[PDB]
Amino acid sequence: TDDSHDWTKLRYMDNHMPADAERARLFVRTSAPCTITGTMGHFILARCPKGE
Amino acid sequence: NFNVYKAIRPYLAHCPDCGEGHSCHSPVALERIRNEATDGTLKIQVSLQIGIK
């Protein structure tokens, strides 16, 4: 939230003010859990298995 | 019995895929997967040594 680059944290909108959260609990899934190779800003890189 | 494991230790070995589509030497190296049992049980050989510290 304080505009500091911390690779272990992420911020999100809660009501009207941004709030921090733990990056280690960010997950992506397609039909099985995927692997998040890289993250930055709004964008995520994931190597997901086949799914719909 | 685990007395046979007193003289031996785990090791590192090559791995075709370390979870990201790249090759890195891993403490878990998949040596040989044998599925000879007819009920689907797998016996897996890995570089670790489980049950002994």
Q: Any idea what the shape of chain A is?
A: elongated
Q: If strands are numbered along the chain, what order do they take across the biggest sheet of chain A?
A: 1-2
Instruction: Determine the structural class of chain A based on helices, strands and strand pairing.
Output: mainly beta
- Kindly report the greatest chain-chain contact and the residue count on each side: A-B, 3 and 3 residues
Instruction: Report how far the terminal alpha carbons of chain A are from each other.
Output: 34 Å
Number of E strands of chain A: 4
Number of helices of chain A: 0
Radius of gyration of chain A: 13 Å
**Multimer state:** part of a larger assembly
Q: Helix and strand succession of chain A?
A: EEEE
Which sheet architecture does the biggest sheet of chain A show? 2 strands, antiparallel
Query: What amount of the residues of chain A lies in strands?
Result: 35-45%
The percentage helix of chain A is under 10%
PDB class: virus
Keywords: CHIKV asymmetric unit, virus
Entry title: Cryo-EM structure of Chikungunya virus asymmetric unit
Chains A, B: E2 glycoprotein
